[PDB]
Every structure is written in C-alpha cells, then in structure tokens.
Design a binder for this molecule. Structure first.
Ligand SMILES: CC(=O)N[C@@H]1[C@@H](O[C@@H]2O[C@@H](C)[C@@H](O)[C@@H](O)[C@@H]2O)[C@H](O[C@@H]2O[C@H](CO)[C@H](O)[C@H](O)[C@H]2O[C@@H]2O[C@@H](C)[C@@H](O)[C@@H](O)[C@@H]2O)[C@@H](CO)O[C@@H]1O
Ligand SMILES: CC(=O)N[C@@H]1[C@@H](O[C@@H]2O[C@@H](C)[C@@H](O)[C@@H](O)[C@@H]2O)[C@H](O[C@@H]2O[C@H](CO)[C@H](O)[C@H](O)[C@H]2O[C@@H]2O[C@@H](C)[C@@H](O)[C@@H](O)[C@@H]2O)[C@@H](CO)O[C@@H]1O
Ligand SMILES: CC(=O)N[C@@H]1[C@@H](O[C@@H]2O[C@@H](C)[C@@H](O)[C@@H](O)[C@@H]2O)[C@H](O[C@@H]2O[C@H](CO)[C@H](O)[C@H](O)[C@H]2O[C@@H]2O[C@@H](C)[C@@H](O)[C@@H](O)[C@@H]2O)[C@@H](CO)O[C@@H]1O
Ligand SMILES: CC(=O)N[C@@H]1[C@@H](O[C@@H]2O[C@@H](C)[C@@H](O)[C@@H](O)[C@@H]2O)[C@H](O[C@@H]2O[C@H](CO)[C@H](O)[C@H](O)[C@H]2O[C@@H]2O[C@@H](C)[C@@H](O)[C@@H](O)[C@@H]2O)[C@@H](CO)O[C@@H]1O
Ligand SMILES: CC(=O)N[C@@H]1[C@@H](O[C@@H]2O[C@@H](C)[C@@H](O)[C@@H](O)[C@@H]2O)[C@H](O[C@@H]2O[C@H](CO)[C@H](O)[C@H](O)[C@H]2O[C@@H]2O[C@@H](C)[C@@H](O)[C@@H](O)[C@@H]2O)[C@@H](CO)O[C@H]1O
Ligand code: CA
Ligand code: CA
Ligand code: CA
Ligand code: CA
Ligand code: CA
Ligand code: CA
Ligand code: CA
Ligand code: CA
Ligand code: CA
Ligand code: CA
Lengths: 103, 103, 103, 103, 103
C-alpha cells in the first residue's frame, strides 16, 4: 500500500502527477445524461475531469468517484490548496485518479 | 469529452448558456409529492429549477440531480459566485443541466 | 411547473405559507423508534416538524424528506434567514412541505 | 406527535433529559468491528454515545442513527451549543435518542 | 461499551494509540481501482491510511469506513485538532480504527 500520492500514481501505467500547489480556479458539474461529470481548472490553464462512471469501474470505484466530486466541490468552496493531482493522461481532459491537499 | 460547460451545453438540443457571474439570491426546495424539486433565483429576476425526476431522465442522472441540489444549496449558503448555468430553455422555469463556479 | 414556493404550496390541500423572514431559533432531531423526525422553532413561537416517513408519503418523497432535514440543520448552523415555509396545517406541529431562503 | 425534545423523551421508557447548554468538548468515532459508534463528551464530564446499530433498533432508525452521527460531527466542528440531549440511561455511556440545539 | 478511544482501542490486538494533538498536515484521496483509500499525514512525519474496503471488513464497518473518510476530509479542511488515533500497527501505513478530536 503506497504512503503518498506520487507512489500511488506510480502503480498505474496510465497516469501522471501534476504539481499545482494552488487552489481550484473553477468548478463545473453536470447532470446532463451521459455527462454526469465534474470539471475543475487552475489559473495556469490545467483542466481536469472526474470521469463519467462506466464499465471501466468496479463497484468500489463508483463510490469513490462520487466522493471525489464531493471533495472537489468543498475544496473549491474552501479555497483549499491542491498540492498534487494523479491523473490518467490518455483521457481528454485528463481524468483525476487522486488528489493531495496540503497548506 | 467536453472540457468546459459551454462545450458540454453545446452537446444537447434546446440548451443555452446563461452567464450570471453572481451569487444565488434565493434557494427553495420542496418535498411535496410530485414536486420534489429545487428553485433558485438571481437578483436580476432569473429563475431556474432542478427538475423533479421523471421519465425524461435516465436512472443514472438521478444521482447527479441530487448532487446538483446539494451544490446549489451550499453555493447559496457560501455566497459563491455562479459563473454560468447550462439550461434547457424550453422549460419554465429554465431547467439546470450544468453549473460552473469561478471567482 | 411552479416558479415559487407560494405557487407550489397552492397546489396542495391543507397547506399554508408562513412568512418567517428569520433564522431558525432551535433545531431538534430524534432517532427514537417511530419518532425519527426533526423539529424547528422560531423566535415568534412557531414550531414546525419534518414528519416521520410513512404511508402518507410516496417513494419519490423519501429522499426529499432526508434532504429537508439536511437543509434545516445547515440552515440552523449558518444562521440562514428562512423566508417562507409551506406547511401542512392539519398536523401538530405543522409539517414542512417546502422552504425558501433569501438573504 | 411531540412538539419538543422534553415531550418526546417522556414517550419512552428508561430515558431522561440532560440539559448541557454547552458545545461538545470532544468527538470520537470508530470504524472498528462491532464498535462502529460515536462518543461525545462535555466539559462537565458528561459522556454520551450513539449506539452501534443492533437488534434494539428498527429499520426506520438506521438512517436516523447515521444522521445523528453526521449531526454530532458538524455540531462539534461548528462549536454549536447543545441545549438538551434525550438519552437512554440504561446504557453506559448513556445513548442518545434526541438532541436539541439553540443559542 | 467503551467511554473513550483509549478503552476502545484496548479491545483490539495489533491496535495502538497515537497521540497527535495536532491538525492534519495533508489529506490524500484516491479513486484508482484497488486503491480506493485515504491517506493523512501529520507534521511529525506520521502517516496513516483508511484502508481500501475488503474481505477483512465485516458488513457493519463498510458505512463506518466511508464516514471516517468524510470525517478526515472535513477535519483537514477545518484544521481541527486530532487528539488521538487508534490504529492497526500491523498495516503499512498504519490503518485508522478510530479518531478523537478536541479543542
Ligand atoms: C506535456 C505534459 O506533461 N502535459 C500536457 C499539459 O501541459 C502541462 O500542464 C500545463 C498547465 C503546463 O503546466 C505545462 O507546462 C505542462 O506540461 C497540456 O496542458 C495545456 O497547457 C496549455 C498551456 O497554456 C493550456 O493551459 C491548456 O489548456 C492545457 O491543457 C488542459 O489541461 C491539461 C492538464 C489536459 O487535461 C488537457 O486535456 C487540457 O486541455 C495538455 C495539452 O493537451 O497536454 C498534457 O496534459
Ligand atoms: C420572476 C420573473 O418573472 N423573472 C423574469 C425572467 O424570467 C425567469 O427567468 C428565466 C431565466 C426563465 O427561467 C423564466 O421561466 C423565469 O420566469 C425573465 O428572463 C427572461 O426569461 C425569458 C423566457 O424564459 C428568457 O429566458 C430570457 O432569456 C430571459 O431574459 C434573460 O435573463 C434575464 C434575467 C435578464 O438577464 C435578461 O437581460 C436576459 O435576456 C426576465 C426578463 O428580463 O424577466 C423577469 O426577470
Ligand atoms: C445528579 C447526579 O448525581 N448525576 C450523576 C452524574 O454526574 C453528574 O453529571 C455528570 C455529567 C458530571 O457533571 C458529574 O460531575 C455530575 O455530578 C454521573 O455522571 C458521571 O459523573 C462522573 C462525575 O461524578 C463523571 O463525570 C462521569 O464521566 C459521568 O458519567 C458519564 O456521563 C453520564 C452522563 C453517563 O452517560 C455515564 O454513563 C458516563 O459514564 C451519572 C453517571 O453515573 O450518574 C448520575 O447521573
Ligand atoms: C514518511 C515517513 O518516513 N514517516 C516515518 C514514520 O512512519 C510512518 O508513520 C507511522 C505512524 C506508520 O503509519 C508508518 O507505517 C509510516 O510509514 C515513522 O513512524 C514510526 O513508524 C513505525 C512503523 O513504521 C511505528 O508506527 C512507530 O511507532 C512510528 O514512530 C512514532 O511516530 C513517529 C512519527 C514519531 O513520533 C515517533 O517518535 C513515534 O514513535 C517515523 C519514526 O520512525 O519516521 C517517519 O516519520
Ligand atoms: C394568526 C393566528 O392566530 N395563528 C395561530 C398561531 O398563533 C400565531 O403564530 C404563533 C407562531 C405565534 O406567533 C402567535 O403569537 C401567533 O398569534 C398558533 O400557533 C401557536 O401560538 C402559540 C402562542 O399563542 C405558540 O407560539 C405555539 O407554539 C404556536 O403553535 C405552534 O406553531 C404553529 C405554527 C403550529 O405548527 C402549531 O402546531 C405549533 O404548536 C396556531 C396553533 O395554535 O394557530 C394559529 O391559528
Ligand atoms: Ca479568497
Ligand atoms: Ca489553511
Ligand atoms: Ca453577504
Ligand atoms: Ca472566494
Ligand atoms: Ca449570531
Ligand atoms: Ca448572507
Ligand atoms: Ca472556540
Ligand atoms: Ca450562533
Ligand atoms: Ca491555519
Ligand atoms: Ca475550536
């Protein structure tokens, strides 16, 4: 079991760490059908998504996707500094797999 | 996959973007039978709804509908600026499909 | 679709609008068996309940009842001004069907 | 139906009202097998639990028990004054049935 | 029934009390398949996890695991002081069983 986000992200061939060290600039969410997703941005121009759930996810992933959307919303509204994101960089915009917050 | 609210909105028929750049003026919610909805207003007189779940929603949007009302409530209570709403403009009040918050 | 709490409330028998224009004075909640409810009071003496879920309710109201107790708790804790309540006046205390909040 | 926590408590055997008029001094929660509970304390030395779900609880209480833990946590973190607790006094620590907040 | 976290922790083997008396330095959360977990750190170098849910957790702990991650996120965002953690010291990093928070 990894002990930080960088070592977690290393376990997935399909991933990359972004180091932001900045609050979320905008939060977007959608209830439109097949686009039940969130999108966040940073002042540096980075855009990331929390993906729509699909067959790419086992049951535990579904719950954690909902959690991540909860986390990004409150992080936005509290101006919490996001340290790093672990993202899938094959998806466009890059999909969030993990988040670290420190400040 | 859309990278922003406007791209997302532009995916659907009978939608438009409202650019509010303002906090929500009022928040209403009902648990009355057949009217399990929310209504928000802005100072400019704009009124929007999160629709009652009916036939026009696939069962997967049900969770996103619940999340949207949670988002609107906490946005209202934190006085968070709403940047844009993507709405079905053929409903009265116009029906919320997506939201972005910035600044 | 109604555009406001007053018009929504008018769609049901045995309801009326109370116009409080005030913060909730007290918030009570119970997990006791057959009393799984919330009660709020206002400085003016008004007492209102969120009713225990039951036969009088329909399936789509279940989630909305829970949402309403969520809303009253966080309204209480943020000292949010309650504009209006739509309530059933054939219950004691009168039973909340909808709420609006405005600055 | 009761109109306040004192009348509510009187409906049950083995209960009594604790009048605290004070914030929660500490909040503990456990995910440990068979001790999935919350414990709260007050500065005066009072200690109270939200019981582990069990055969003393009917199905309608399950969501209420989870709600009460949500309530205690947020009350703790907001330093919200707890007026009264309705508790079962045939358990150690006494087991919360109902909470009233006012300040 | 335990009245505090220390007496609670003693009911289990391979569990130990860590007294932090400090706020959470960093909060990490992941939705990656098979790593649906939270990691928290403290300034003193201590690292703790909420475990990915698994065959080692009984049914009554599944809800409590999701709650704990909720509790840790909100604790991090409010800079709440963690008094003690009860953890399984046979996991790497050590896995949270319970938390106490006090002023
Ligand atoms: C090459 C790489 O490692 N990643 C790129 C990413 O660039 C990275 O992130 C940006 C913000 C900056 O820190 C770069 O130095 C860094 O390599 C690209 O990001 C785009 O950057 C431009 C710069 O102004 C715009 O801001 C653009 O909107 C950014 O793309 C968005 O954000 C990304 C994280 C992706 O999710 C992308 O799909 C978004 O449109 C992108 C460009 O495709 O490609 C890698 O992510
Ligand atoms: C309380 C009231 O009567 N408000 C109207 C407002 O209509 C409300 O809000 C709109 C968005 C819609 O959801 C209505 O069903 C609801 O009553 C009017 O806004 C216009 O409404 C029409 C037809 O719905 C179009 O939506 C039009 O785009 C709206 O005007 C735009 O939004 C306004 C708030 C202004 O920013 C205006 O400049 C925009 O063009 C307004 C018309 O001013 O009248 C009341 O506020
Ligand atoms: C009227 C009377 O004699 N009450 C006691 C009560 O103590 C009183 O109330 C408590 C909260 C505290 O302020 C006491 O100082 C006060 O005298 C007993 O509560 C325990 O009291 C001792 C101190 O005497 C400790 O403070 C202890 O933590 C208290 O018990 C805990 O909290 C209680 C509310 C119960 O949930 C109990 O199970 C916990 O262990 C109680 C309990 O024996 O007995 C009378 O009510
Ligand atoms: C990032 C890093 O290298 N941290 C170590 C820290 O270990 C981490 O945190 C502990 C709680 C545990 O979850 C580890 O699995 C995790 O990597 C070290 O902490 C000690 O770790 C061992 C187990 O490896 C025991 O848990 C031991 O009790 C821990 O020491 C206590 O906590 C420390 C932070 C100090 O307060 C120490 O005085 C305590 O005894 C520490 C020390 O080895 O070093 C890094 O911080
Ligand atoms: C216009 C009128 O006569 N209305 C009464 C209610 O009395 C009015 O509203 C109260 C909230 C007070 O502001 C009162 O001064 C005002 O005239 C009456 O409510 C009760 O009033 C008594 C005091 O006389 C207490 O305040 C009591 O708590 C009130 O009742 C509770 O709150 C209500 C809104 C309902 O939910 C009741 O079920 C509660 O018990 C009501 C009920 O007697 O009757 C109207 O006709
Ligand atoms: Ca700011
Ligand atoms: Ca801070
Ligand atoms: Ca203001
Ligand atoms: Ca701000
Ligand atoms: Ca005040
Ligand atoms: Ca305000
Ligand atoms: Ca204080
Ligand atoms: Ca206050
Ligand atoms: Ca600080
Ligand atoms: Ca404090």
């Amino acid at each position: 079991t990894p002990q930080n986000i960088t070592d977690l992200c290393a376990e997935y061939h399909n991933t990359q760490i972004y180091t932001l060290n900045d609050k979320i600039f905008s939060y977007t969410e959608s209830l439109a059908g097949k686009r039940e997703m969130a999108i966040i941005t940073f002042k540096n121009g980075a855009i990331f998504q929390v993906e729509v759930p699909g067959s790419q996810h086992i049951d535990s992933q579904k719950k954690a996707i909902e959690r991540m959307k909860d986390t990004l919303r409150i992080a936005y509204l509290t101006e919490a500094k996001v340290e790093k994101l672990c993202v899938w960089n094959n998806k466009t915009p890059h999909a969030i797999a993990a988040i670290s917050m420190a400040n």
